[PDB]
């Protein structure tokens, strides 16, 4: 629902150091917007 | 934006109308949440970090101090407390058909939409004295639920007017005035209990109290006097407890009457000898009366 | 014929069980041998017992309760019960499309889910067969694609006919009131009823 | 004796006043009921 | 008592205003009270808003008024946009400290009458108060 | 209670903005409430932002608006990056010590109507409040 | 099957014991003679009793325990358990290299460590023979070079075949459950179970 | 939990910088709440640093940005050493009393977009804050 | 810092940590001299720390300690100590509170307490008859770490949600002066509101069961 | 654990410090850890009198990987180096506990020299360093 981003220092590519922080974004990146309209349009054109 | 009591405001909402007690003198309030907590010591692991959860809003107490106001709006406190009403007259019914107390609703308002709202409330006490000072009426209330909110119902015609002028107390019995008064103090009550409703259906939800039942009502008073006797052998002003005394107490603007009462006495050998009367109605007594009169 | 509750009557919240006790009864005869073996023999059915307690009740919700209980007594029917702690919809789909082969018996069920269902059961889920009132409890589960198997307690009270269907959701116990032969309510001068409690035993 | 009243909305047409709110408007900045995975599968 | 006839309405600019009212008879001699809709036939309703109680004060607007479904005791009252904007234009300038969007406008009074002599040909107040305007931005 | 009409919004600058609102009847008949979408066919929404509550205040933007679903009862309103960029230069210059990005912008006001008149009333004020802009440093 | 615990499921942190009570049961005929003598005779097996109390449980961990117990009931197997306070290591080494002469009997064991083991057990440590479920307690220990001698209680149930291996760590009791016919659990209003407890008995 | 969008950053002089982040959707309908890796397909990231919120404030740097493990929700952002030198040159001299090695340098934002559905795009300001340079005596 | 070391924090240079679970049973016993002129000295033989407690309330931070001791006697002499002397007092500096580097507006105070609840084992026996008896051993019942914060009530905009009354959970929280730092990696917050003349809020803080070790650091002023 | 680590040296005595690097993964509980292979890593550092980029240098560490498979590395200073610091550190001998004496700031880098001709750097430690005065030869 909310989505959680963990972020952390990068030391050497693909390796990382423990000091860590958290972002708590209040709305999922999956939640849609007015894109609903154009998606309905293109689904109807597929129909 | 901060907030300030010196410009806070209180509005009472009931019956789909709203009462602006403009003439507030003081108020005090708290709010809190109850929590369940266990530390779960275990010989596998003597855990040091507690496990705990918040469950419910505590029932807030509310306390108010109000000056008497011409236009008498505060009589509605007695109406909500559960006196029956006949114009400006109030009566205790000798027995009562209520079970739940009269529920009502409160806004606390401030600048910048910074408002608070108390949803279910009941009056538990009204209490005042005529002790040689501007009579200030205390009220004790409880409320079962609160929340913060951005807005409030306007109220503008039902505003508590100007304060009534001072006047001295009188006490009397059958029109005998009583010599050497020092004070009179009154209290009226509506003792109640909340019905605990919390259920396993409420798990992982915040819980509130929602209903309460009336346990009792009380009306009682105290009087303080200087000790006096008419002549040494007299009997009328002795210590011994009288009973079935009709008793009347008034100011210029307020009147209280006990048609029959029982009097306890206590005497104190302070530097001037003092007497306290404790007053209560008798079981056969008729309805105690209260009246209000507006100053011109 | 559900026992009324906040979900059916949110206005009458006092009807929410203050606390509930679920008991397994597994009647068994057992002895201890001097060589320190334990030996035990099973006969008679397992059955679920339930105990319910209520707080103080106001007259309206009480009258609704009595209006239910006396209807039950007059009709001689059954009391259906929901049990909120198990109310999770972790399995869903066209349950009535599943095929259970006939002749399964004893404590293991295997099913062809035909790829229809989504999600999985968990140990401690409730489980029921569509044509029989019994409530079972999941001990264990396995997949092999569309084929499922579950080992279930208590042992099955029936042989599968092949018409059965599983039921993962909305399981209600069917019960009757063993306490009911001396039932009655105290009325206090508060105007509130008190001391109500119920002892229930499933019945088939 | 008693009088009860409510505001006259544009949608409700006309009906007896009532002692409760009727309608509710719910606001959000986004829809959580639809996933991108669903909406993409639907288009695709 | 004036304590319970009184209701401080709040109109809002550039938009018409309207109320609907239900008349219930009641007696609480039983708990809960016995209640019925009053049959409103042969009544009619009036009222106006004026900028002051004084006898010279301006009539700011007259209500549109109408019984409907008189058997069910309903009635409706309303103001046109022309009324709302005129009072918007004529109310006071001094914005209310708790709510700067709103301004005081004046006093109003609703009274009703029997147009057939029944047990009386008579009139009485039913509702009173004072009127505030919320200012507003969109047309 | 009261309608809670008062709501304030924050717009993130240099990025498009959109808000969705759904109109429902609700019947409290059972614990899972019987909510129902209202038919929005033949309705329209208007709204504007102005710098101050005045007869001739500056106007900053008009909302873009539409109905997404007449039967799910959903309307939406939105602002482009061009609009909100026009905001960001005319909103005030004060910044809070603990919250430097947030700036006051203006007052807003959402008004709804039937496209074909009921005549007795035609529109109502859904919601109102004020708008803040949050400064941002990317494009 | 191994009882679940904070070793097997460390995330179920509540699932450890709040208290235990390891009781010795030693059935005897006793007689009191008029001359004041007390006679005692050892007959039948000594057997360990174990009472366990859990702390309050959340529903998930409770459901895991419930499913385990039902799976035990269904199978009719044995409950295996390890006491953590004894679990603390003292001896370490390749116990497979220890060799026990056959034909030892009575409460004294001797063995050749070949020098492989390190440390020594303390009095009150547990001890077990790899081929038999019984558990014994070390009353005393004596070293002589690499040979060890141990006095154990109770006396050995079986003569040494010469193929045993000792086990000092990870000793599991094999047990059977005495409450099982009436077990039942109360959902507290705060959302926890309480009083969950087991009276286990060894079985041989 | 708290909807914190805000985090400050500490780069270090003479040394390249890089940050990795992992996206998880968390659902609290069932307990404990379930954490799931976000499929990061089709998203993209940007972000910039400039010395003040002002609309004229000059850009100091922009991030290199890349996706790392789309099935695992991993992405990374970084700054080259030259960028770090520019930061160190532009930054304040003023020091910080809690850590005298840190000097204030500017504001940043890592605006993120999705272009997954219907070939149409949307963007939001996922993370924001200040950025500091820490001084280093090793060269 | 040795007070925290004796209280039973684990130590890593100047860093202290609560271990999530502890291998102690007895608390760390130690010994105290009270010394005065003229050999007029007193000696307390077995002791343990029960509390450490302080606040950053706009005043020179003073650290309270509660100790118990099981035995005392008067004595003519004491062990000298001269290099392990507590130095000069650190200069004043103002408190900061923060979450994920968000600073928190309108602080009024922060108050902390740490505990090592213990019980003495009663040992007195009929063997002790006609002898004076002392306590000799105690066992650790519990540890606690907890804090309170007082703030003025503030809101960013009327409809905001972040600074509401409702209790947050899983908040990472950091408290510091110039010279002292305390960190709760995850915490549970109760709130209480008081309608005093300016509206005040109290936060009650506690670590969550899953939280990592709370950290404490000290830094010397130059 | 932060980057911040203070250092105390002993006057007129050689100094040496040892470390090893590991990976960690708590997905197995109790948390797994394994020594990181250090083959190809290299270290640098200096001690300088101030954070100011103009500040004078006081000393440079010697440093060496000691076991790549155990992931261990070491740092040291000779008594000649420490002597150079002793001559030049501050003289604010504390009135009550005089042995401790401030000298400066330090930073230690490592460079992951590696195949592929990439290189990257990250700072492992950073702090203040103090001398303790040395009364005996």
Author numbering:
A (entry chain f): 8 to 54
B (entry chain L): 2 to 297
C (entry chain I), G (entry chain H): 1 to 204
D (entry chain d): 6 to 49
E (entry chain S), F (entry chain R), H (entry chain Q): 2 to 140
I (entry chain L): 76 to 297
J (entry chain T): 4 to 140
Pull verbatim passages from the article behind this deposition.
The T5 family of viruses are tailed bacteriophages characterized by a long non-contractile tail. The bacteriophage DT57C is closely related to the paradigmal T5 phage, though it recognizes a different receptor (BtuB) and features highly divergent lateral tail fibers (LTF). We present a composite map determined by electron cryo-microscopy (cryo-EM) at resolutions ranging between 2.9 Å to 4.9 Å of the entire T5-like phage particle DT57C, and atomic models comprising its core structural proteins. Our results provide a complete atomic structure of a T5-like phage, provide insights into the process of DNA ejection as well as a structural basis for the design of engineered phages and future mechanistic studies.
The first layer directly interacts with the last TTP ring and is composed of an inner trimeric ring of TTMP surrounded by a dodecameric ring of LtfC. The inner trimeric TTMP ring is surrounded by an outer ring composed of 12 LtfC monomers. LtfC adopts a compact, single-domain structure composed mostly of β-sheets, with each TTMP monomer contacted by four copies of LtfC. A cavity remains between the TTMP and the part of the LtfC ring distal to the tail tube, into which LtfA is inserted. The N-terminal portions of LtfA form a lasso-like structure filling the groove between the LtfC and TTMP rings, such that each LtfA copy extends in opposite direction as observed from the outer end of the helical bundle. The capsid-distal LtfA contacts the capsid-proximal LtfA from an adjacent LtfA trimer, enabling the formation of a closed ring. The β-strands of all LtfA copies interact with the LtfC ring by augmenting their β-sheets of the latter to eight- or nine-stranded sheets by donating one or two strands from LtfA. The loops of the two long β-hairpins of TTMP extend tailward and contact the next ring, composed of six copies of Dit. Finally, a trimer of TTHP closes the tail tip complex. The cavity enclosed by the TTHP also contained additional density for a small α-helical coiled coil region, which was assigned as the C-terminal part of the TMP based on its location within the lumen of the tail tube tip, the fact that this region is predicted α-helical, and a close fit to the AlphaFold model.
